[PDB]
Design a protein around this ligand. Structure first.
Ligand SMILES: *[C@@H]1O[C@H](CO)[C@@H](O[C@@H]2O[C@H](CO)[C@@H](O[C@@H]3O[C@H](CO[C@H]4O[C@H](CO)[C@@H](O)[C@H](O)[C@@H]4O)[C@@H](O)[C@H](O[C@H]4O[C@H](CO)[C@@H](O)[C@H](O)[C@@H]4O[C@H]4O[C@H](CO)[C@@H](O)[C@H](O)[C@@H]4O)[C@@H]3O)[C@H](O)[C@H]2NC(C)=O)[C@H](O)[C@H]1NC(C)=O
Ligand SMILES: *[C@@H]1O[C@H](CO)[C@@H](O[C@@H]2O[C@H](CO)[C@@H](O[C@@H]3O[C@H](CO[C@H]4O[C@H](CO)[C@@H](O)[C@H](O)[C@@H]4O)[C@@H](O)[C@H](O[C@H]4O[C@H](CO)[C@@H](O)[C@H](O)[C@@H]4O)[C@@H]3O)[C@H](O)[C@H]2NC(C)=O)[C@H](O)[C@H]1NC(C)=O
Ligand SMILES: *[C@@H]1O[C@H](CO)[C@@H](O[C@@H]2O[C@H](CO)[C@@H](O[C@@H]3O[C@H](CO[C@H]4O[C@H](CO)[C@@H](O)[C@H](O)[C@@H]4O)[C@@H](O)[C@H](O[C@H]4O[C@H](CO)[C@@H](O)[C@H](O)[C@@H]4O)[C@@H]3O)[C@H](O)[C@H]2NC(C)=O)[C@H](O)[C@H]1NC(C)=O
Ligand SMILES: *[C@@H]1O[C@H](CO)[C@@H](O)[C@H](O)[C@H]1NC(C)=O
Ligand SMILES: *[C@@H]1O[C@H](CO)[C@@H](O)[C@H](O)[C@H]1NC(C)=O
Ligand SMILES: *[C@@H]1O[C@H](CO)[C@@H](O)[C@H](O)[C@H]1NC(C)=O
Ligand SMILES: *[C@@H]1O[C@H](CO)[C@@H](O)[C@H](O)[C@H]1NC(C)=O
Ligand SMILES: *[C@@H]1O[C@H](CO)[C@@H](O)[C@H](O)[C@H]1NC(C)=O
Lengths: 445, 144, 144, 445, 152, 446
């Protein structure tokens, strides 16, 4: 009875919103590595002791499949990548006819025909002079013209830029921070499937650090589930969707390139250098990855159990290797040690439910963001490379199309980088704060 | 904590309105000036033309929204206050319930969801009321 | 409507002060929110470095001009009001017209031209009056 | 008197001002035209219901010859043009000696010697190879060296860029909109000749849609006068000022390029293509435009009566062809279907007062804004081109020369692009809002 | 003869004056922070050719634009504090926070007649945050008390 | 209880040291119908025709020229202006070819023997299908032997050399640095200000005095003078790793010339690109040189010694030496008279022990500015004969350091980065940020 409208400013309420997030990192943690693309362009430091405010009795709706934080992360990674490569040597002078022969010196049968020894006429500083040089190329980067004449694979389609020889692409944790006027809500519910209401919601200033690891089929160095393996998808029934599986216990994978390479610096113009592969010291052997067999077998058993909960207790689940298509999506991709390893995962997905050595190949000329027209040439890395990584999740697709769903088949998939992000950002949402509110009171002016 | 009162009841949350009001500007100045401690960050980041423009758009907009809300409070005669009481009666259509249920044992998030689309009506009413008050003051001061 | 009062006499036009005051900022925010309806050129237009800079300069300046007027009202002791009276007497030299010829029989556009030459004088007088008033209150409150 | 200063904020007062206006096109008009230069760089949606506030008893002074809106439109259109051609193929590799002969196959007399067949040595995707290619060129794009050897006309002035073939330049109406804090005033007066007060004015937030048509001598697809032909000039007296004539009726002009041309693509380097003109399929005939004779004769007579009001009643009024100079100013010029036409208008302006076929020539190398250091190469357009346009106005120059015995002669003029803009922006003015003011009242604190 | 008259020769003319005398120029040092910005921008209209040229330098453009935005943000921050403390709209504001002899132990005649503002803000520098916190607490109490009186 | 209360004041005249971005202004008439000018075109903002200064009576601020951020800003801005002016120009990559060179032996004085070379080469034409044989003259310093007729331009094994656009003048004009609102520049007016310390007589200004961005390496040209005494200003006078940065109280003049009458040969090299080559020299060939008056030079050097001794003693020996170490940028006096780059030998100025003079000069065309190697500039030839007279207003000297702690100490001409020339003119200014809010006790309460 006789209540009046009052106005309150500073009311703690919010709405869903899309804004620009700032990139921040732990400055001490870069340890002077200012040549790391991720550190130099995410220069602003994070605050020590990031705070988290639990919000008692606050329920909020999260949806990882429509989360614009993913789209923004995707766009910014591509942008930084391109800026990193902008101020560097172009290899258009390198798109010449090559005269190639086989590398046959102390080479295993397992790589016969894998490497080619190519000689060519390339420029020098003075326009008037030319020089004869050679380099060993991986077969995947070289294409036959009309059996000794070859060209680099991208001479018809795109320009090639050599990656900057001092720049590191090693992932570091990156934190996304809200601008003032916005807040990030974090879902800490266990067994959260990505789309439902979240009971335990807290407010943070910045996200935890996420390493921008680039990979296909398997997800490396991500977060683990704490209770059990969690299977998330936009739509389970629809076989056109990717299924993201988060493991609770990691699987360790040991990868190497055993060949001892010597890099050769070639002058190509005034102030311009090209880095060639030189020659190999010692025997030539295949690059490969080792996955503990028992651990992998246990890991699938857990994944299968969770799939059965959604697909039926008497449903047979089969794993199979990937379908044909571009190398970039049919195989696993590491980007480790500075070399681009493309690994054959069929040994991991060959079972029916009801150490494993994976051979790998190296490719130097690549198109990371599925774009056509901008190719990067990775300079050679000297010496022997070894990487030990954590498998934290999988991207699977289901074939569908079976008769009466008698059995189901799953295969490694992914390749759309957005899903690598969605696997880490599913717990976060960005909201706008709207401080002005109205309510009745027992007062009059 | 900045949204710490989100789960508190309306009449409890209202005890600490000042912190939300402050964060809107203090956060901007600290993030842009005090957080940006290493001079090489600005020197390098200025080379990313697109990031430079996007970040400015975000700051400028934050200011524009702040000012729009302040102008609105000024128009309604609530300038300088976190708590403002005015002479516009509450209509049961907007909400018909006891002032016990509304102020206490209910949070602000719930309240905002319930008022919903009635907000625009209220704002128009507040603006007209203040204009009538200003005219009346001007006339009284002319009577001596 | 906005500026629909341009042909009205000064008295009648005083009923639309709210309309013109709101447009100074509300148009800025709405103009920015409108582009969210077509996100694809929000991204494309960031490549037009020159347009990026020119639009921000336009927005920044609009804010600076708005604030300058608000600061000035604050200095004169009129913060928060669309209409305020002061203690500065009107000088017949500025204008020697009857109130019957100012608040009627003339528009604001005409008036502004009529007294344009005295704007700075009037403003200086307003500032001095407020300084004396604040000093007097400071002294009065010390006699408690 | 016992009056005091009263301060008012929100006073409906404005002053002449210069600001930056923003571009907004209709949203539905966007369709899928991300490749249309006007839609892609001005997608900001317009208000579906622009408002107009008529101002009773307001009489503002407008001056179209000293506006600011015109200069901004000129500056912005040039910038958008330059940014559309930026990420495109450079044709530097085509500045070679050409070996040319005449195209003599099924040529009507009208084009004998107009089109040439040129072969040349051009680069290819590998630096070690060359290819022999040929294409057809119009004789204005090719200049003789000292006797079958020719070069492109732009080889001794500037590098030429090929416009990207997917990009459309077809005009889309755009609207200029004021930023908040500013307003656009518009004249509604009929028979308003510029440079003076308007009685009926209104406030709008955006201008009407204006098509950014680039043309000379005649103005195409503009607005029509409501009642009478209106002649506008800065100084009707001065022979150095252009006369802009706005018509109340519209003369329809039918333009065609009857030849059935073929486009061919030649790879010139990695990722780059040159689009060349290939053999013509049918007979070779000249481009031309048709103007109905009777309609033109009546239209011109109307213009003459209005000139007769400014000049003496017994004046002999004559029309004549343009004086010499660059093709861009001596002939009519427009973009039809994407190709550039230059037409001979001496057939329209050859009379004394007391179907018309205009032959046209096509040119591919364009210096569109009269800037010596830049040039653009128009890709050929496959097939037959036809368009129909509305002649809405004229640009005339009084020949002057202090000719005695009242025999004024008018000749088509043009070339200052600002004058096309001035025919649409003449009714608009930009003012700023200045909310503070003071006035005496009998109120005291 | 000195000390007779309060005229200062320009914008920081009172910088060397005592604290009391300097109160005479508070308007001068207030308007400048904002009106200076507008005039500096207005002045670029004296050379339209310069403005066109400067837009060609991306870095200069952005750096100046950042400077303007930051100046505005600092201005607003300080105005918000005056709002929070209940001093909005005033150049001089009396509050209900008592003075602590700990912050500074001086007579009022000593402060207002012998100290300049450039000395004062060094001696009291260590208590700035304390005082601001107290001012906020005081205003919070006052607003809730007013609401209860209106209710009664 | 005392009953004193907190009072908040806004508009309080106080400030704190601060670093901000200043803007670059020029004189609205400094245009002089000249826009091709590297300074005038970018620092295009006109200044106030009637600048004002506010004397702050009873203000004593501390100034420190060695930590003065205004200097750092000019260093960054001058480099940027340089780089943004050479941007829309000819890249001259077609000139990195083998040259066939012989000595210029026609009308050569002995001092010019071997100084100039006549080089022929095959470069591009408007059409990519045609080459042309052209020739030009080069100074020996810019041409190196390829393993004795084949030569290449000196920078082919480092970087691209762009051609400066021939219309742009680099002639310094006065520049004024101006504060953004909220900031102010304080100026020190102490007639004998030493640097690094308190200054009385502090004034507030909006913009600095006009400063000409003159670039030189040993002698400081066309700057301000001290008014009463020669002043020696250093960061640390006893640290031989620092610079003595002498400023004189009287100017002396140096008369420089490039006596040869040159012509310029304009060559098309591509579709809108032209190269400017040095053509044949008219008349005979003589070396560039600069004059100073001997007595005048002795007198100012003697003044420096009297002042320098104040830090070392009245029975010490001050010896001057001809300087040493590094390439020409730090061994000779560089100054760009008339647009050509002169590198003059100053040993004749520092050959005395305290207890007319002709300086020979060499000309270089390929210039590595600001001690960088990433980019080089080609200076187009200037036709006719070049002559100028400059004002020497200061010196950059260093001390060798003592050895055995003997009576004699040696002061040798220095060199260094551009920052020292800037410190020479900006020693008087400091930037501060105004902070209008403050608190003090009163007797009033609400
Ligand atoms: C310390 O401070 C001193 C004093 O300011 C300064 O010395 C002065 O330097 C400037 C710049 O080098 C000198 O100015 C030049 O002087 C020559 C001399 O010409 C005289 O004789 C001709 C007749 O033959 C007269 O017409 C002329 O007025 C003189 O009396 C001028 O020729 C120069 O003009 C050209 O360059 C200008 C650059 O901006 C152009 O604006 C101008 O239009 C001219 O260019 C045209 O002609 C060129 C030559 O043919 C041609 O190459 C161009 O393409 C174009 O067609 C200019 O005015 C000034 O005289 C010096 N004064 C003294 C006393 O020495 C020091 O340089 C400074 N020290 C340092 C280290 O910075
Ligand atoms: C998942 O997360 C793991 C970490 O938990 C990542 O694995 C690490 O990856 C980094 C980067 O590739 C490895 O760092 C490198 O280690 C080399 C080890 O060499 C040792 O032995 C030589 C002997 O001569 C010594 O000289 C040397 O100091 C070491 O003791 C270093 O040689 C490397 O430095 C060289 O290369 C870099 C290239 O950027 C240059 O900048 C350096 O100057 C130098 O030339 C470098 O430090 C690290 O060892 C890896 N650890 C493990 C356990 O594997 C995975 O990569 C990540 N997974 C994915 C997919 O990203
Ligand atoms: C004054 O105003 C008039 C009227 O708007 C302009 O004339 C029009 O100009 C446009 C652009 O040149 C013409 O549009 C073209 O029409 C061709 C014919 O299309 C027929 O078939 C389609 C179905 O497939 C029907 O929808 C259509 O109505 C016709 O019956 C199309 O083939 C063209 O498409 C090709 O070119 C465009 C642009 O390069 C590409 O984007 C396409 O992918 C494709 O390759 C195109 O749509 C229009 O027909 C003209 N009107 C008339 C009556 O002829 C004047 O140009 C304008 N004057 C000036 C100076 O600006
Ligand atoms: C207004 O909000 C109420 C909330 O209960 C909702 O039921 C109603 O549909 C809303 N009105 C419109 C037009 O959306
Ligand atoms: C215009 O003048 C007439 C005079 O009769 C007046 O009635 C009308 O209200 C005026 N217009 C406006 C907008 O006030
Ligand atoms: C246009 O009309 C005005 C009056 O409306 C008149 O003064 C002027 O002479 C006319 N002529 C032109 C072309 O301006
Ligand atoms: C003058 O500068 C020197 C630096 O060599 C410093 O030691 C000395 O104290 C300064 N003089 C004064 C009065 O500050
Ligand atoms: C060069 O020397 C010759 C003598 O062999 C002389 O005739 C000539 O004049 C000299 N040069 C010029 C251009 O004067």
């Amino acid at each position: 009875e006789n209540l009046w409208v009052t106005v309150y400013y500073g009311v703690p309420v919010w709405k869903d919103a899309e804004t620009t997030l700032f990139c921040a990192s732990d400055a001490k943690a870069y340890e002077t590595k200012k040549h790391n693309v991720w550190a130099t362009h995410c220069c602003v430091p994070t605050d020590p002791n990031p705070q988290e405010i639990h919000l008692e009795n606050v329920t909020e709706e999260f949806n990882m499949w429509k989360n614009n934080m993913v789209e923004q992360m995707h766009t910014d990674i591509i942008s930084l990548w391109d800026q990193s490569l902008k101020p560097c040597v172009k290899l258009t002078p390198l798109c010449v006819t090559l005269q190639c022969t086989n590398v046959t010196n102390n080479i295993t049968d397992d790589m016969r025909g894998e490497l080619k020894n190519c000689s060519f006429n390339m420029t020098t500083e003075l326009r008037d002079k030319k020089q004869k040089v050679y380099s060993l190329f991986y077969r995947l980067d070289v294409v036959q013209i009309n059996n000794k004449e070859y060209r680099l694979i991208n001479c018809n389609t795109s320009a090639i830029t050599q990656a900057c020889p001092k720049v590191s692409f090693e992932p570091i944790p990156i934190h996304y921070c809200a601008p003032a006027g916005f807040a990030i809500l974090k879902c800490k519910d266990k067994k959260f499937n990505g789309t439902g209401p979240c009971t335990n919601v807290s407010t943070v200033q910045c996200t935890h650090g996420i390493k921008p690891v680039v990979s296909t089929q398997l997800l490396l160095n991500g977060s683990l589930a704490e209770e059990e393996v969690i299977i998330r998808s936009e739509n389970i029934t629809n076989n056109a969707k990717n299924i993201l599986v988060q493991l609770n216990e990691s699987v360790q994978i040991n990868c190497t390139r055993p060949n001892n390479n010597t890099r050769k610096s070639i002058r190509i113009g005034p102030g311009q250098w090209f880095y060639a592969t030189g020659d190999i010291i010692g025997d030539i052997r295949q690059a490969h990855c080792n996955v503990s067999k028992a651990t992998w077998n246990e890991t699938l058993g857990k994944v299968v159990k969770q799939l059965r909960k959604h697909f039926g207790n008497n449903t047979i689940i089969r794993f199979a290797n990937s379908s044909g298509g571009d190398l970039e999506v049919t195989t696993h991709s590491f980007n480790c040690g500075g070399e681009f390893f493309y690994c054959n995962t069929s040994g991991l997905f060959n079972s029916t439910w009801i150490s494993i050595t994976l051979p790998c190949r190296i490719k130097q000329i690549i198109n990371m963001w599925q774009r056509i027209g901008q190719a990067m040439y990775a300079p050679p890395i000297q010496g022997v490379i070894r990487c030990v990584s954590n498998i934290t999740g999988l991207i699977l697709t289901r074939d569908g199309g079976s008769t009466n769903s008698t059995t189901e088949t799953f295969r490694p998939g992914g390749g759309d980088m957005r899903d690598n992000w969605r696997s880490e950002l599913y717990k976060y949402k960005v909201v706008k704060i709207e401080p002005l509110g109205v309510a009745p009171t027992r007062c009059k002016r | 904590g900045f949204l710490g009162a989100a789960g508190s009841t309306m009449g409890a949350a209202s005890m600490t309105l000042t912190v939300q009001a402050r964060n809107l500007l203090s956060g901007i100045v600290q993030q842009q000036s005090n957080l940006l401690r290493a001079p090489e960050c600005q020197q390098h980041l200025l080379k990313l033309t697109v990031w430079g423009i996007k970040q400015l758009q975000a700051r400028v907009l934050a200011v524009e929204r702040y000012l729009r809300d302040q102008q609105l409070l000024g128009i309604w005669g609530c300038s300088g206050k976190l708590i403002c009481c005015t002479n516009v009666p509450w209509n049961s259509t907007w909400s018909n319930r006891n002032l016990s249920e509304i102020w206490d044992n209910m949070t602000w998030l719930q309240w905002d969801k319930e008022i919903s689309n009635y907000t625009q009506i209220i704002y128009g009413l507040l603006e007209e009321s203040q204009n009538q008050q200003e005219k009346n003051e001007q006339d009284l001061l002319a009577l001596d």
